[PDB]
């Protein structure tokens, strides 16, 4: 269009070739991945359940892009963004199922299971506190399968040594504690001093619909207002948007199968 001021959008989620200060991102260098892309932890730990139809809930997101940006800045954007959306879905699902965070739609979660059974250990990381944490599971005939931890506490785990065998209980190379694998959560909600464990075979999940992507050049984005408050029309404003959706289902077969260690 002939507008020489860039379009202000509310919310400002539209990708643009030109910044608010007038900078065209011409000649633009290809972005590169400063971090490893994160993979779903409950999809790693939990037990898959073949499921037909939906309890399930629907995850989804829409990424609008100005066609000037899709032309003159980063042409490949929508191919390079699909994994980043898959990351975002993994993180949303993990945070809902594990921590009961992010307005999880299910009435089920590990945090709620632990908060219901009160299976929590107050204390700092010590060999005796790790053993007590595991014994809270083995009390009810269930054996720990893995650990969930904030990666920032490996500094605490390296300081623990078995005083009989006189060796590190934590293998920093294997990233396994007491012979059990430790998975790391990048989310900000699990605090430094918090550690979770359980028999994750008691946690069941299903995926009725894999991540489906649809690119559209014509729809109306009711949720994104132009500066004047009119809804964004993709075709008429010369805009493109990518829709991604997935269906996920979560089940906890035995809510006593999970225990948590927390700072005193």
């Amino acid at each position: 269009s002939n507008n020489v001021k860039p379009q202000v959008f509310n919310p400002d989620n539209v990708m643009m070739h030109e910044k608010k200060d007038g900078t065209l991102m011409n000649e633009f260098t290809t972005p590169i991945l400063q971090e490893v892309m994160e993979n779903s932890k409950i999809m790693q730990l939990g037990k898959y359940e073949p499921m037909e139809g939906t309890r399930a809930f629907k995850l989804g997101v829409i990424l609008p892009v100005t066609k000037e940006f899709l032309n003159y800045t980063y042409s490949q954007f929508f191919e390079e963004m699909k994994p980043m959306i898959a990351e975002a879905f993994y993180k949303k699902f993990d945070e809902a199922g594990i921590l009961n965070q992010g307005n999880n739609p299910f009435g089920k979660s590990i945090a709620q299971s632990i908060e219901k059974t009160n299976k929590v250990i107050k204390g700092d990381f010590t060999q005796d506190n790790i053993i007590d944490l595991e014994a809270l599971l083995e009390d009810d005939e269930l054996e720990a399968n893995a650990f969930i931890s904030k990666t920032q506490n490996r500094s605490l785990l390296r300081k623990i040594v078995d005083p009989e065998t006189k060796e590190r209980i934590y293998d920093r190379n294997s990233d396994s504690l007491d012979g059990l694998p430790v998975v790391n959560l990048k989310s900000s909600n699990l605090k430094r001093g918090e550690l979770i464990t359980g028999d994750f075979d008691k946690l069941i999940y299903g995926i009725p619909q894999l991540i489906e992507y649809k690119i559209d050049e014509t729809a109306q984005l009711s949720t994104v207002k132009n500066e004047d408050g009119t809804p964004v029309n993709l075709f008429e404003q010369d805009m493109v948007a990518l829709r991604a959706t997935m269906h996920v289902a979560l089940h906890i077969a035995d809510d006593k199968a999970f225990a948590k260690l927390v700072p005193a």
Partner: protein
């Protein structure tokens, strides 16, 4: 390769996924060859490019 059915088989190896590391001497004997392939499902583009 000598196949499992015990037959000598010859197969082309794609150039985009194969290369050879040669001896540094003027004779350039081939020291070792490598092949590497991206495992993928048909649709769900992997977030890790696992080779």
């Amino acid at each position: 390769i000598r196949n499992q059915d015990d037959e000598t088989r010859l197969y082309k190896s794609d150039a985009m996924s194969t290369f050879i590391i040669y001896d540094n001497t003027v004779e350039r004997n081939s020291i070792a060859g490598v092949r590497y392939l991206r495992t993928k499902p048909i649709d769900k583009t992997d977030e890790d490019e696992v080779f």
